[PDB]
Amino acid sequence: VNQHLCGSHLVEALYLVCGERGFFYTPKA
Amino acid sequence: VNQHLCGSHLVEALYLVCGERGFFYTPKA
Amino acid sequence: VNQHLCGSHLVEALYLVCGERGFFYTPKA
Amino acid sequence: VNQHLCGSHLVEALYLVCGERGFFYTPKA
Amino acid sequence: VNQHLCGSHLVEALYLVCGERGFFYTPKA
Amino acid sequence: VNQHLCGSHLVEALYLVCGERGFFYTPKA
Amino acid sequence: GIVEQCCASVCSLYQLENYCN
Amino acid sequence: GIVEQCCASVCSLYQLENYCN
Amino acid sequence: GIVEQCCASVCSLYQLENYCN
Amino acid sequence: GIVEQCCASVCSLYQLENYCN
């Protein structure tokens, strides 16, 4: 589906979806 | 992918995955 | 009291209040 | 009802329960 | 940095920053 | 200050600390 | 209902219990 | 305190009311 | 159920789809 | 990008995978 994800919720989705692999969090500034 | 997901953590993986249809969380079962 | 609860926060309140019992999450679509 | 609530989890049960009056979280005690 | 923190997110920041010490959550009413 | 921070918990401490620059979460490493 | 409401307006944990099983 | 009663132990929504300021 | 398969066990995003209503 | 979008608009978990390593 589609998800409307902001702030800390964005990073949980990333923690979950990459789990194991790890990830980069790069917001625009 | 493949993680340990306990207590509230699993309910949150559930909302992300499921989104709009939603889910049932029946631990008894 | 009263709580203003949206998105994933709605589901945590449900995880807590039903705990043990389990629950159904059925948003309107 | 009756759950195991550790670390941040307990502070979140606290905000939901307590709401507007708020709370004190004094673990030392 | 600066953080825009509302509702339950406010209390997580407090759970983290005081950790050990504990804290008071006193919203205005 | 000094806490045990596991799984999603650490990614959340990361967003609060880091904020706008953001972070990398490389567990493999 | 539940979601609509808890978000749109306000809702107490008592109303929330109508959702467990 | 809260931790013992609630993290080691178990406690209900009822008992958290005692920590509402 | 879900808990065993996922908290004791391990499971993927794939398996959570089975609990989407 | 990611953040802008996932928040501003909407985003699926498939797009999200472009962020792991």
Add this chain to the structure above:
Amino acid sequence: GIVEQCCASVCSLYQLENYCN
């Protein structure tokens, strides 16, 4: 104060420390 502010406007973790005990 705290809440009003951290939400309404912006607040740093340094200001937040004024809340522990």
Add this chain to the structure above:
Amino acid sequence: GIVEQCCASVCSLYQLENYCN
């Protein structure tokens, strides 16, 4: 890495700064 230093170990807000991109 981060996990060991922080989940097995213990670490402060100070050490998380090292993972800020």
